[PDB]
């Protein structure tokens, strides 16, 4: 009696996936590993560094720019970048615009096979006389990497395109058995990778990792 797997989706940002019925205990058995994978192992892009021309360090402030360096960094951590080319590793985007104009993420100079999923993302509000010149470093990686040239500032990088994963395993009954399992799995992503895609990738990572048990190399058992 193979279980049904149901999918409910709103946009590319969010989805619910329900697997029922499962045998007793299996809701968690599937639920936990997938979640662990979904939060870390799923590949994506993140800003790992930022350099400002007039800024000596993260805690400084920029004349003619309302928001401090740290706030701008916070606006950079929400930047969603997609690499269309599988060979691409590191890409450096440049933004020079100093005008008294509202600045969005759309203003970054376009690069081949690099797509901005959120062009309307706000960075800073510049006024008359204000000047902003920046080079941001975008890299490919997995999970969350803390910040830990010369004036280039290290940035906490969120690689995981999956923003949040939460699962609930609830009791269910098929005929006689009242102890069966219903596994509900909710996934919030940034739109770079659809929830369904992230789920599939996680499952695949797990399977491939189960393949590693295939080729035994013996060793002796120790005794005192």
């Amino acid at each position: 009696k193979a279980p049904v797997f149901t999918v409910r989706t709103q946009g590319r940002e969010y989805g619910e996936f329900v697997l029922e019925p499962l045998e007793r205990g299996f809701g968690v058995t599937l639920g936990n590993p997938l979640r662990r994978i979904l939060l870390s192992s799923i590949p994506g892009t993140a800003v790992t560094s930022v350099y400002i021309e007039d800024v000596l360090h993260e805690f400084s402030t920029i004349p003619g720019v309302k928001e401090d360096v740290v706030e701008i960094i916070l606006n950079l951590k929400e930047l969603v970048v997609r690499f269309l080319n599988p060979s691409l590793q590191t890409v450096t985007l440049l933004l020079k615009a100093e005008g008294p104009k509202e600045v969005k993420a759309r203003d970054f100079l376009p690069v081949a096979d690099v797509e901005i999923m959120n062009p309307d993302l706000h960075i800073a509000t510049l006024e008359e006389g204000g000047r902003l010149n920046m080079e941001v470093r975008v890299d490919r990686g997995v999970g969350y990497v803390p910040a830990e040239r010369i004036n280039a500032i290290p940035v906490d990088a969120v690689f995981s395109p999956v923003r949040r994963v939460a699962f609930q395993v609830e009791d269910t009954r098929l005929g006689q058995r009242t102890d069966l399992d219903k596994l509900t799995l909710r996934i919030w992503t940034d739109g770079s990778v659809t929830p369904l895609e992230a789920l599939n990738q996680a499952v695949e990572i797990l399977r491939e990792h189960l393949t590693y048990f295939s080729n035994p190399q013996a060793a002796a058992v120790a005794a005192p």
Partner: protein, 52 residues
Amino acid sequence: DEVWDALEEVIHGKVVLLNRAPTLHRLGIQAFQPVLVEGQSIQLHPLVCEAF
């Protein structure tokens, strides 16, 4: 095993009264909709324990 599927239909939408003595105030009797369970024990919501 078809009978229980019928009982599930009987109690659908219905509620039962649970009461614990002594009934000191009115909340010592409350109405819940029953969820059929295996076992001989009544399962009670934790939050209502205080009133009861």
